[model samples]
Target: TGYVGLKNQGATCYMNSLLQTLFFTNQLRKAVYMMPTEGDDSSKSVPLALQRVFYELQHSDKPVGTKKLTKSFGWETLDSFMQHDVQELCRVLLDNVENKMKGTCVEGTIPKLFRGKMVSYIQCKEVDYRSDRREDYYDIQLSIKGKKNIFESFVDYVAVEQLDGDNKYDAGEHGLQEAEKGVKFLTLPPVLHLQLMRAMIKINDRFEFPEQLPLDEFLQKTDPKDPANYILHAVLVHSGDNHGGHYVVYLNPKGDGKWCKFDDDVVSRCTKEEAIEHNYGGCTNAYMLVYIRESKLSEVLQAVTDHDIPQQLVERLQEEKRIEAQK
Candidate 1:
């Protein structure tokens, strides 16, 4: 149920030995099987037996010291103790299951079903044990019927079932040819692919930590007139890649002021037609940026397109115009 660790090497060795003796003797399995069955009229039960063992070990006539007990049990050797302990634990668990079915309606009818195969013994933090400090306790996990089962089943049914005859080589290579046809398939459309690549770049640059400014706080501090406030606004630009690529531009509050582009780390790269078609080796270098603001469709469009206020995002303004006309 738990692991044992010692602050001192001598203590560790002693405890290990004791664990081995207890595990290898099969006494643990006996105790587990003796547990009372559900609705069993018999007075002896598994839990009761386990409790009796625990008390006997803790307050025996010899008054066994932890170190002495461990050494006597053969837990000192890693190989022997580990193998014995695991086997004993498994046997005990199986016994418990068997005891539960004894004299029941399903007695002798249930089939054995091992749940998993991976097993590990480790230590864990115990918060409830005491309030002074973190305490370490033992834990055992068994993962049965996982990759091991898959490999075993594959070997039994596939590899072992296949056999070879005396013929070791083919008679001829007449069908062999020096050349074969090449094939190409488009996984994504050009526009969507370009957009996806750009989105990945933007997302990779975005901050991903708790110390960064929260969205709500960032918005509150940003100036409405300052294009920098809207710069690098995180928005999903492509549905395919799920990355943020939308841009933001802030306008100067003073009259007749020129709009300024705020550089942000988040930007998308353009597509490479040459590379796609001819298998060109160099990286694609085309780059572009866009800006947007939080507002109604009509208001944002008007703000961007106005000649008097060249501070708005031109690309967004043009798109808005086209959409409005169609509507």
Candidate 2:
């Protein structure tokens, strides 16, 4: 999205482009860049690797590579050329980030940026009390059934679905109940990730993802008047079949309307009218949509304000430097 592309080693485009979008969207790279590195601790290595991905995309002349991320997760080598699926790899990347950063904190920021709380409520048909459970989510899968756009599915999607064919209403039965659940935002992280339930195979979601999606309704707000919105920053496009298609991305840089097309190693300032075209057509469609809590001044503010970097990030930075040292 930043005119930065990753060098392809066989079937690595999906993760590469995804990493590219994740880096720029919501200014996550900016937040990661601000994390302080310790010694050889691998706990924060995931964030460190992400910081390096941003570094490589920004300063390196060659297409960026992500072996650190790939190998860290025991994922197949990028050049396996074995024909991989985007959804599978996408899960790996997302899970890796969540697992790595879990319980890890940063001063003045960002551990909360990607974190959110989800609440579940199950009520008995004949009882006065309801069962409640709460948990945290870095991302959530939204089903795409009987809907064309994300908001429709989100708004119309059944918050409470029946557990069985009929309502479980009995005089003295806890068994007769309704499986009811909905999400409320406990905290809104700076960046939000949504997984569109688009299958690489028979993806039921042919989402007409708008340029802007409102998240206020779903967010858990202390003040009901608090403005809750997310600006669409990037869309992951899949342009082919179940066997695996060409992966590309559309980025709304700074969420300011101007869009850029990031196709592997190529970058260009494409028109907004042209950018929205990816929403339809049987060929190319958005598989994953990334949103930011708010907009940032891409024209002026540095995503990162300090160089109080991490050990792994700094070392990776120097490795990329080694490549240029000979050049």
Q: Which candidate is the best by lDDT?
A: 2
How do the residues 218-303 of candidate 2 rate in per-residue lDDT, one tens digit apiece?
65555455455667777777676756668788787667888888887787888875566545444777767777754433421234
Best by TM-score: 2
lDDT of 1 by residue, 212-288 (tens): 11122212133344322122111111111223222221222111122222112111222222112111111221111
Clashes counted in candidate 2 amount to 2
Residue 96, candidate 2: how far off, in angstroms?
6.2
Query: What are the lDDT figures for the candidates, one per model?
Result: 0.25, 0.62
Candidate 2 residues lying further than 4 Å off, grouped into runs, are 25-27, 34-48, 77-110, 165-175, 178-188, 204-206, 219-225, 295-316, 319-327
Q: For all the candidates, what are their Cα RMSDs to the real structure? A: 32.9, 4.6
Question: Where does the lowest 10-residue lDDT sum fall in candidate 2?
Answer: 296-305
Residue 152 shift from truth in candidate 1, angstroms: 10
Which 10-residue span in candidate 1 carries the lowest summed lDDT? 186-195
Clashing pairs in 2: 37-310, 185-220
